[PDB]
Structures are given as C-alpha cells and as structure tokens.
Design an enzyme around this catalytic site. Structure first.
Site, PDB file in Angstrom:
ATOM      1  N   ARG A   7       0.883  -1.162   0.000  1.00 35.50           N
ATOM      2  CA  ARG A   7       0.000   0.000   0.000  1.00 35.50           C
ATOM      3  C   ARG A   7       0.923   1.215   0.000  1.00 35.50           C
ATOM      4  NH1 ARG A   7      -4.106   2.471   4.650  1.00 35.50           N
ATOM      5  NH2 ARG A   7      -4.828   4.208   3.328  1.00 35.50           N
ATOM      6  N   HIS A   8       0.738   2.107  -0.968  1.00 33.43           N
ATOM      7  CA  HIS A   8       1.584   3.287  -1.076  1.00 33.43           C
ATOM      8  C   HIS A   8       1.636   4.127   0.194  1.00 33.43           C
ATOM      9  CE1 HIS A   8      -1.823   6.018  -1.260  1.00 33.43           C
ATOM     10  NE2 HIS A   8      -2.383   5.229  -2.160  1.00 33.43           N
ATOM     11  N   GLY A   9       2.700   4.915   0.320  1.00 33.86           N
ATOM     12  CA  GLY A   9       2.850   5.774   1.477  1.00 33.86           C
ATOM     13  C   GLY A   9       1.713   6.776   1.531  1.00 33.86           C
ATOM     14  N   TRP A  13      -4.662  13.328   2.060  1.00 31.24           N
ATOM     15  CA  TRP A  13      -6.018  12.846   2.272  1.00 31.24           C
ATOM     16  C   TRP A  13      -6.167  11.679   3.241  1.00 31.24           C
ATOM     17  CZ3 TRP A  13      -9.047  13.499  -3.030  1.00 31.24           C
ATOM     18  CH2 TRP A  13      -9.155  14.882  -3.281  1.00 31.24           C
ATOM     19  N   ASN A  14      -5.051  11.099   3.676  1.00 32.21           N
ATOM     20  CA  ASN A  14      -5.110  10.006   4.639  1.00 32.21           C
ATOM     21  C   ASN A  14      -5.456  10.626   5.987  1.00 32.21           C
ATOM     22  OD1 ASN A  14      -4.567   7.166   5.552  1.00 32.21           O
ATOM     23  ND2 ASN A  14      -2.975   8.192   6.761  1.00 32.21           N
ATOM     24  N   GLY A  21      -9.150   8.280  -4.775  1.00 33.80           N
ATOM     25  CA  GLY A  21      -9.179   7.283  -5.828  1.00 33.80           C
ATOM     26  C   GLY A  21      -8.214   7.598  -6.952  1.00 33.80           C
ATOM     27  N   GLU A  74      -6.441   2.382  -7.599  1.00 34.05           N
ATOM     28  CA  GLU A  74      -7.445   2.362  -6.552  1.00 34.05           C
ATOM     29  C   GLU A  74      -8.779   2.438  -7.301  1.00 34.05           C
ATOM     30  OE1 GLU A  74      -7.501   2.608  -2.726  1.00 34.05           O
ATOM     31  OE2 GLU A  74      -9.246   1.769  -3.772  1.00 34.05           O
TER      32      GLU A  74
END
Length: 171
Positions: A7-9, A13-14, A21, A74
C-alpha cells in the site's frame, strides 16, 4: 502464486479522511519516509505498479523499476472523489464498510473494481511485488477471508488465490 502487495505511502487525504481514488495526489514527507523504509524489506522480484503518482513514487523510493498498469489503480470514486468519509451518505458508508453494492456516480462500481483487480492477479504467472492502493489490498485480503485494512507504506504477501502469508508494517 506468491505476490507482495504494497500500500503506497500516505498523502494528505489520509490524515484528512477524504476518499482518494484517481485523484493524483503526491506523497507527504512522511509518506516518502515510509516508502524508503520499504527498501530492503521487500523481496527482489519483478515489480508492477499502479500508474498513479503516489504508487509509482513509493515503488521508486522502495528501490524498484516497475512496469506500470492502470489495472492496479485504486477504485475510481467518481463524483465521490475527495469526499470526506465523515459526511458520506449512509448508503455509501455502508456499501464501503460492507464492501458491496457501491455505485458512485461517474465512477467504478465495487463489482467492476474487483473484476479488474482479480483479472490482473490471475494474469500474474510468477512471483512479484505489486505497488498499489488500500482498496486493492483490501479487496484481496477480503477475498482471502481476512480483514483488509493495512497501514500506508505497509505490505502483505499472499499465496494467490488461496491465503495470506504475512503482513509487514514498519515504524
């Protein structure tokens, strides 16, 4: 087939809690740090990656030169791109929580998303590292009967299409 899904860093928005998306956001400073920590933690195998910036950059900082495939992207949230999870309509929250019956206007249905992801994995004829997204890792983990949430910049190795082998998170 042994496949390492990464899963990318993290991106902004995290922490902000917005649906991310196809919106092409870059990694945050911490996100890049997470990607670097993956170098030396992942096996030296052929690499594939979503063509979105955050995924490609994670692959690069992790020491790989992946072949790009949009099929690893995504899910396309359509009109829900950038929407705050908090204020998402109950029908959508439920569809995403139960991972079923998700039809965002102008985007991809979860059913189409799964078909895309699983058709890509079916095509993997040899062990490899796949730089991708939380939704993709989740779809795979769920299909293997396990909770699919994993931290940004973390990885999971699976024996597709049978079981999960290991989950790797670094601090």
């Amino acid at each position: 087939m042994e496949l390492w899904l990464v899963r990318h860093g993290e991106t902004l928005w995290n922490r902000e809690g917005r649906l991310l998306g196809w919106t092409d956001l870059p990694l945050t400073a911490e996100g890049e740090a997470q990607a670097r920590r993956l170098k030396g933690a992942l096996p030296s195998l052929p690499a594939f990656s979503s063509d979105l910036l955050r995924a490609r950059r994670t692959a690069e900082l992790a020491g790989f030169s992946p072949r790009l495939y949009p099929e690893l992207r995504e899910i396309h949230f359509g009109a829900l791109e950038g929407a705050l999870w908090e204020t998402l309509d109950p029908r959508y929250k439920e569809a995403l929580l139960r991972f079923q019956g998700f039809h965002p206007p102008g985007g991809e249905s979860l059913s189409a998303f799964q078909e895309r992801v699983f058709r890509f994995l079916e095509g993997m004829k040899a062990p490899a590292v796949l730089f991708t997204h939380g939704g993709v890792v989740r779809a795979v983990l769920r299909a293997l009967g396990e909770d699919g949430l994993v931290p940004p910049g973390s990885a999971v190795a699976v024996d597709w299409p049978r079981r999960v082998l290991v989950r790797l998170a670094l601090d």
